[PDB]
Amino acid sequence: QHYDESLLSRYYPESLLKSIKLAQQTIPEDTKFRVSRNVEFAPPYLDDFTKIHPFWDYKPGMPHLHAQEENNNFSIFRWDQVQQPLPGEGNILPPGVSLPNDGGRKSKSADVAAGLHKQTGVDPDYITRKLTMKPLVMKRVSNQTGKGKIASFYALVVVGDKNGMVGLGEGKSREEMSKAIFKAHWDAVRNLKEIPRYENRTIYGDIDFRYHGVKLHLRSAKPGFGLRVNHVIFEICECAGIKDLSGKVYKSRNDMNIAKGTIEAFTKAQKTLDEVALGRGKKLVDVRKVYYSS
Amino acid sequence: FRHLKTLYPDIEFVDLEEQYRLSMVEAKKRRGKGAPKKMKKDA
Amino acid sequence: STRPYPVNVEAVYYAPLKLPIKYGDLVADIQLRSYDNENLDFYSDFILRTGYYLGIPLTGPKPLPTRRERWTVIKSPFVHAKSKENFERHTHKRLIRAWDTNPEVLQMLIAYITKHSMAGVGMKCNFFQRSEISLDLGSTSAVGQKVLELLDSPDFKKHLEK
Amino acid sequence: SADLYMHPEKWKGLPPQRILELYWERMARLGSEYKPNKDELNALLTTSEYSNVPVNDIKKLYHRGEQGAIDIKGGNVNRDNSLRPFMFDELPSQAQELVAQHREQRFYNRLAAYELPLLAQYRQEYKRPSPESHPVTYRYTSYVGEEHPNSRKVVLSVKTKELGLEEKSLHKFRILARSRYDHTTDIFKMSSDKFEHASQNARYLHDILQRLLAESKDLTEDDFSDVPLDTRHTIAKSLRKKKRDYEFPEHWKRPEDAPKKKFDIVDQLLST
Amino acid sequence: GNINNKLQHLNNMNNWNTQIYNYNKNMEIMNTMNDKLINKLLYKMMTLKLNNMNINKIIMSKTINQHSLNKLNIKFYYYNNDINNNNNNNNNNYYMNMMNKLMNIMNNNMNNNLCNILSYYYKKKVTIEPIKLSYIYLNSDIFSKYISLNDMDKYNNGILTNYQRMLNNIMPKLNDHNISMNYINNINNINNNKYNNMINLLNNNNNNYNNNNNNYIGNINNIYNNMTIDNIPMDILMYKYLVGWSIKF
RNA sequence: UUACAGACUUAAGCAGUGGAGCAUGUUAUUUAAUUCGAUAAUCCACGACUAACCUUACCAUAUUUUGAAUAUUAUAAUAAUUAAAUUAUUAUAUUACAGGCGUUACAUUGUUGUCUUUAGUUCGUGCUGCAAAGUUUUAGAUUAAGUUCAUAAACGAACAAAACUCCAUAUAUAUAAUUUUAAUUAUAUAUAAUUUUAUAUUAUUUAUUAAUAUAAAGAAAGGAAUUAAGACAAUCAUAAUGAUCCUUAUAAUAUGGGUAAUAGACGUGCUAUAAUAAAAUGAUAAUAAAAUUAUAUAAAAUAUAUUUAAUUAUAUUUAAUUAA
Ligand SMILES: [K+]
Ligand SMILES: [K+]
Ligand SMILES: [K+]
Ligand SMILES: [K+]
Ligand SMILES: [K+]
Ligand SMILES: [Mg+2]
Ligand SMILES: [Mg+2]
Ligand SMILES: [Mg+2]
Ligand SMILES: [Mg+2]
Ligand SMILES: [Mg+2]
Ligand SMILES: [Mg+2]
Ligand SMILES: [Mg+2]
Ligand SMILES: [Mg+2]
Ligand SMILES: [Mg+2]
Ligand SMILES: [Mg+2]
Ligand SMILES: [Mg+2]
Ligand SMILES: [Mg+2]
């Protein structure tokens, strides 16, 4: 289409009007333009080519194959910065990727909380605020292979909220011990269980439990007695919220099997007073508690 | 490269290939493996 | 009213326009050569656009037979195993012909396209000038000179004496 | 102005960035021939606020140079950020090559949109030389942007029957041209690249043409009418080119078997 | 599509460091030899010294010699780590560091610019375009030169456990498949935006006899509606993301 | 130590070759030199992109000595700069050196080679075992063969094959004012197949199946490149780095010679040992492709061998073309 100078003079710069006039006097209005399917001369988008883009066009004053300035008339005298910054926002960050501005600020508890929430539906806030994690066993194991000895880091950790909920987790990593602890912490939260506690301080009565080669003898204790038990049992009691306990481990004292045996004993070897009363159809009275009641 | 020290007096260029050779010469002098003094035709 | 896109900008998005040949007087042959076709074709398209505005009827780019050069490099084994790597170079050729144009306009075409040439493209131009049989004012080798000098030197004159 | 950078006296009153740009231009354009000037330093001190550089430092930096800055820094030990993490702010060099390709395309597109149309001012109407007064054709060759020995070559070609020679003189002309005449095409072609310049070679061929025509038109002594034209050279050339000189027999054509255009009402109705 | 667009493929001419064609083969051989020699010379001009203990090594890629009919453009990528004045001040705005002095003799120096010297060696106009790369892992040639020449104290007694770790955290591990599929979706969207534009411009009618020969669909604006420089170019550009890297010592 | 399958190889079949002369490489021997190229007992040291000079690395004789480089310090000749000194260039001289086909019994690195590996590792998660660990069906089916497809408390990613990609082939569009003509072509772009469907037969894991044949549609029938490791070879006269040795000589130049010697031996070729095969002749000229021509390709013609002429060889002359 051929347009009158008035219209074309309201959209295009004066410097380009002469070129438009000459083109409208050399190309007949009835020109049937054909599309080339061998050579693509124009870009894949529409452009009047009246403005120089700061990025998609050559930089004015910069030397290059098609620079029209004389060699003594270039205007780039500083070379410490990139001449043509990226267009638009200034970045090419892929959709769904984040610029790594900050590194080393992650909390492994928050990483465990986010992953478990997505995988199991547990509340992240409870994991990151209510739970305490204590490593119990940290050793290196090795497998003999044809290539050679392959070492691995083994971590056994216990987590708990100090209010009845405790869990045991194990983790392995061939790379570093920190990765093994992360997996163990992850596993421990998934294994969280509630343990009955008498007066939220001790166990119900005494427990004689056999876990593989470990013989566990645990006795309930008076208020203010403290934890007088194997060190492995001490850590578990701390996380679980057991304050008063006495006990002795016989036969095997393997730390790993003491920890698992203890967790199992607290669940499979205890019976609440309420559960005993309902099963037998009898009333069970705590004499010490009644003595100080109204 | 030898013409650069007069074309551009302001800039100080370093020839790493030449510099490497000169260090290897000094090293051999320190080990006693230097080059024999060349005989003079006058002799 | 939307922004008007004039015919000059629109032409860029379509195949280059060609002017009809009226008389058929071939005035120039422009042969372009490159080791790759992509710049060769793009530059050829630009020449057709330059000629159109200059009023030069142009034909082409006619593709001419591609020349293939080959080289075989025997490798270290030469044991009749994968012991001969092959290499090749292809010269791509294009011919653009100009018709019924005055010499001055033809020189403007060559000057402009020379100023805005692409990397790795070569250009040969054959100009054809029709002239009259009789013109006005029209349109010794080094070895021979030395031979005369040598034959005058005494080492040769001393024998030529008759 | 282009020469403003050479006149630091005239920088006073220019905006802060313009003065710095003119200071950078004088250093780049002069290089080792650069000598500190008071006027230049006076203008740079006026930019201590645009850059927030202490007015004292400017003076040292202007007289010391990089060493001065290293002293102001207090040390020369800057962290080695050679393996720093990528901030998705720059493009790979291979992607920068594809952007350069696109910068070139846009450069040519802009020329075709607004620069090529201006060439229409130089259009000249073809002043065709009459085919009868201008029968000779001089071919010149130009290798653009190259020094090539063949650029000197000039070729001259003409149809003998357009030379205005009588019958007897035309025969003598063709006899004396020998291998330079092709009877089949009637073309007399001679080329010369003996001289170093095309103009010299063009004159040389022109002079030979006049000499050949003069001898051919001087039939006072010999006309070489007894001597028949020798075409052996043309025959040898013809044997090296394949001749497809066979056409479909006319008595084999069956025009009655050609498809007959059918009647399409739609096209017949769409035309009215 | 990919090879018919300048933003979606690398021109084969770029596969060669000397981009030239001369009818005179001897002149082509000479130009090729001149490009290797100048490349070696430039490698020797990259090492600069301010003082005995301030040696700045600029890492330069191989040169791209673009030989056109009228000029020769020598394009190269360079990396420089500014270790002398890497501050937050604007003191660099009042002096020319050694790297700026070196870059300004390529074209700007009025008396002894390297371009004029080379213009006589090549007998043609010569321009030099230095292009700065900010990271050393954006060009394979620069990356190899840096390691080879500057990281020797890290791998001369085995590859340091920290050195290797840095060479493995350079880039976040982008998902190539998701990036590859995002690119293909954008192309389909752009391709379907132009087909819809024409289908609409045809169904709306923008000589019946001429309606069987010409293929002109209508105004350029309508055919390319919603296809501008602000959305098409950056989405189709290829080789935009580093997705893999293998280093060896 | 058992069993299984598949290899590479094997022999089988077919078509060529095995001795003679000569060409060429190696060995041995000879030689002033016949430059260099191999030593942990099967065999076996091979450079045909051109060794008269050059090449050249070897021998004889003669000759050169900071040499081809960079720098230092002097001396000059020269041009600028600066008020005669400075700086530039050049030459000469000076001394660190330069140079070295000297050294793998000169240590490492490259390079390329061969060589197995190439559906297997590592990682994430899940699951089993108190645990080291394992991740199970499965010692799956199928193909010439990861070939192709199934399947299991495993699932997925990366990895690489594969896909993909290019070439060829068929077709479409564009380009050529169809005398640069081969339009029966040239070369850009696009499409096509890793073919498809019905039917009968034989097997099957018998079903929505393979092997088969039958019918139909189709131009459709062949190739290329491709991972990372592991174990091993080569001096690369095809690039390095160090150490080590020569420095009036193990460096450099010239003339001539040698690498071309000849008892035996070996490899690889050429021409032959005649009639399913050799030799002549075949001009309106039976029928190609791929290349080459500015450090050129050389037409036709004439002359001589040489005879009517042709043929073959050379000379004379140097047409056209630096090229669809
Ligand atoms: K001889
Ligand atoms: K696992
Ligand atoms: K034809
Ligand atoms: K010899
Ligand atoms: K025979
Ligand atoms: Mg001639
Ligand atoms: Mg003949
Ligand atoms: Mg021919
Ligand atoms: Mg010799
Ligand atoms: Mg000799
Ligand atoms: Mg040495
Ligand atoms: Mg020697
Ligand atoms: Mg377990
Ligand atoms: Mg799996
Ligand atoms: Mg020999
Ligand atoms: Mg024939
Ligand atoms: Mg002849």
Curated annotation (Swiss-Prot), chain A:
Keywords, sorted A to Z: Mitochondrion, Ribonucleoprotein, Ribosomal protein, Transit peptide
A cellular component term, taken from the record's GO annotations: mitochondrion
Subcellular compartments: Mitochondrion
Matches recorded under Pfam families: Ribosomal_S5, Ribosomal_S5_C
Primary location recorded for the protein, binned into one broad class: mitochondrion
Keyword Disulfide bond: no
Annotated GO biological process: mitochondrial translation; translation
Transmembrane annotation, as ranges: none
Its job: Component of the mitochondrial ribosome (mitoribosome), a dedicated translation machinery responsible for the synthesis of mitochondrial genome-encoded proteins, including at least some of the essential transmembrane subunits of the mitochondrial respiratory chain. The mitoribosomes are attached to the mitochondrial inner membrane and translation products are cotranslationally integrated into the membrane.
Additional free-text comment from the UniProt record: Present with 6680 molecules/cell in log phase SD medium.
Family affiliation: Belongs to the universal ribosomal protein uS5 family.
Protein name: Small ribosomal subunit protein uS5m
Species of the source: Saccharomyces cerevisiae (strain ATCC 204508 / S288c) (Baker's yeast)
Gene (UniProt): MRPS5
UniProtKB/Swiss-Prot annotation, chain C:
Record keywords, A-Z: Mitochondrion, Phosphoprotein, Ribonucleoprotein, Ribosomal protein, Transit peptide
Coiled-coil annotated residue ranges, if any: none
Signal sequence range: none
Localization of this protein: Mitochondrion
Main location: mitochondrion
Assembly description: Component of the mitochondrial small ribosomal subunit (mt-SSU). Mature yeast 74S mitochondrial ribosomes consist of a small (37S) and a large (54S) subunit. The 37S small subunit contains a 15S ribosomal RNA (15S mt-rRNA) and 34 different proteins. The 54S large subunit contains a 21S rRNA (21S mt-rRNA) and 46 different proteins.
NCBIfam families according to UniProt: rpsJ_bact (TIGR01049)
Function as written in the Swiss-Prot or TrEMBL entry: Component of the mitochondrial ribosome (mitoribosome), a dedicated translation machinery responsible for the synthesis of mitochondrial genome-encoded proteins, including at least some of the essential transmembrane subunits of the mitochondrial respiratory chain. The mitoribosomes are attached to the mitochondrial inner membrane and translation products are cotranslationally integrated into the membrane.
Family to which this protein belongs: Belongs to the universal ribosomal protein uS10 family.
More info: Present with 8480 molecules/cell in log phase SD medium.
Protein name, per record: Small ribosomal subunit protein uS10m
Organism phylogeny: Eukaryota, Fungi, Dikarya, Ascomycota, Saccharomycotina
Gene name, Swiss-Prot/TrEMBL: RSM10
From Swiss-Prot, chain D:
BP GO annotations: mitochondrial translation
UniProt-recorded Gene Ontology molecular function terms: structural constituent of ribosome
Miscellaneous information on this protein: Present with 3150 molecules/cell in log phase SD medium.
UniProt similarity note: Belongs to the mitochondrion-specific ribosomal protein mS35 family.
Protein's job: Component of the mitochondrial ribosome (mitoribosome), a dedicated translation machinery responsible for the synthesis of mitochondrial genome-encoded proteins, including at least some of the essential transmembrane subunits of the mitochondrial respiratory chain. The mitoribosomes are attached to the mitochondrial inner membrane and translation products are cotranslationally integrated into the membrane.
Top-level taxonomic group: Eukaryota
Protein name, as recorded: Small ribosomal subunit protein mS35
UniProt key word Mitochondrion: yes
Localization per Swiss-Prot or TrEMBL: Mitochondrion
Subunit field text: Component of the mitochondrial small ribosomal subunit (mt-SSU). Mature yeast 74S mitochondrial ribosomes consist of a small (37S) and a large (54S) subunit. The 37S small subunit contains a 15S ribosomal RNA (15S mt-rRNA) and 34 different proteins. The 54S large subunit contains a 21S rRNA (21S mt-rRNA) and 46 different proteins.
Annotated keywords: Mitochondrion, Ribonucleoprotein, Ribosomal protein, Transit peptide
UniProt KW Mitochondrion keyword: yes
GO cellular component: mitochondrial inner membrane; mitochondrial small ribosomal subunit; mitochondrion
Swiss-Prot record, chain E:
Keywords: Mitochondrion, Ribonucleoprotein, Ribosomal protein
Subcellular location: Mitochondrion
Single Gene Ontology BP annotation: mitochondrial translation
Superkingdom as given in the UniProt entry: Eukaryota
Subunit text: Component of the mitochondrial small ribosomal subunit (mt-SSU). Mature yeast 74S mitochondrial ribosomes consist of a small (37S) and a large (54S) subunit. The 37S small subunit contains a 15S ribosomal RNA (15S mt-rRNA) and 34 different proteins. The 54S large subunit contains a 21S rRNA (21S mt-rRNA) and 46 different proteins. uS3m, uS4m and uS5m form the narrow entry site of the mRNA channel.
Family that this chain belongs to: Belongs to the universal ribosomal protein uS3 family.
Function description: Component of the mitochondrial ribosome (mitoribosome), a dedicated translation machinery responsible for the synthesis of mitochondrial genome-encoded proteins, including at least some of the essential transmembrane subunits of the mitochondrial respiratory chain. The mitoribosomes are attached to the mitochondrial inner membrane and translation products are cotranslationally integrated into the membrane. uS3m is essential for mitochondrial protein synthesis and required for the maturation of small ribosomal subunits.
Identification of the protein by name: Small ribosomal subunit protein uS3m
Organism: Saccharomyces cerevisiae (strain ATCC 204508 / S288c) (Baker's yeast)
Organism lineage: Eukaryota, Fungi, Dikarya, Ascomycota, Saccharomycotina
Encoding gene per record: VAR1
